[PDB]
C-alpha cells in the first residue's frame, strides 16, 4: 500500500498492447481453445509470439480455429493482403466491416472477462 500523486504519465504509442483482446502471455496451447469456448460464430483474439515481430491472430470459423499471420511493412502492421495499418487497432475495426473468412467477420473479440462469464457461476 504506497501512493501519493498521480494524474497523465508517460505517453503509450502502443495501444494495440492496452486493449482487452489483446494477449501477451498467451499460447496456442489455450487460444485455440478459448475460441471453442465461445458459443459464438465470429470471435477473434490477437497474441504475441516471442522469437520475431511476427503476430498471428487465432479466429473460429463456423467451429473450427484458424490463424492468421500478421507481418510488418515499415512500421506499418499487415493482415494478409495490401492493407496498411498504424496499428492493429484500425485494422481491427476496418475488418468489423468487411469479412474476414468467408462471410463472417470481428464481432466478438475474445476478451478475459468474457472467458470467466462463460465458465462458472462465480468468478474471483
Do not use: Q
Amino acid at each position: 500500500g504506497s501512493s501519493g500523486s498521480s494524474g497523465d504519465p508517460v505517453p503509450n504509442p502502443n495501444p494495440h498492447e492496452s486493449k482487452p483482446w489483446y494477449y501477451d502471455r498467451l499460447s496456442r496451447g489455450e487460444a485455440e481453445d478459448m475460441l471453442m469456448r465461445i458459443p459464438r460464430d465470429g470471435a477473434f483474439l490477437i497474441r504475441k509470439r516471442e522469437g520475431t515481430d511476427s503476430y498471428a491472430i487465432t479466429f473460429r470459423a463456423r467451429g473450427k480455429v484458424k490463424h492468421c499471420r500478421i507481418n510488418r511493412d515499415g512500421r506499418h502492421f499487415v493482415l494478409g493482403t495490401s492493407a496498411y495499418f498504424e496499428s492493429l487497432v484500425e485494422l481491427v475495426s476496418y475488418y468489423e466491416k468487411h469479412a474476414l473468412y468467408r462471410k463472417m467477420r470481428l464481432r466478438y473479440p475474445v476478451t478475459p472477462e468474457l472467458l470467466e462469464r462463460y465458465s462458472g457461476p462465480s468468478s474471483g
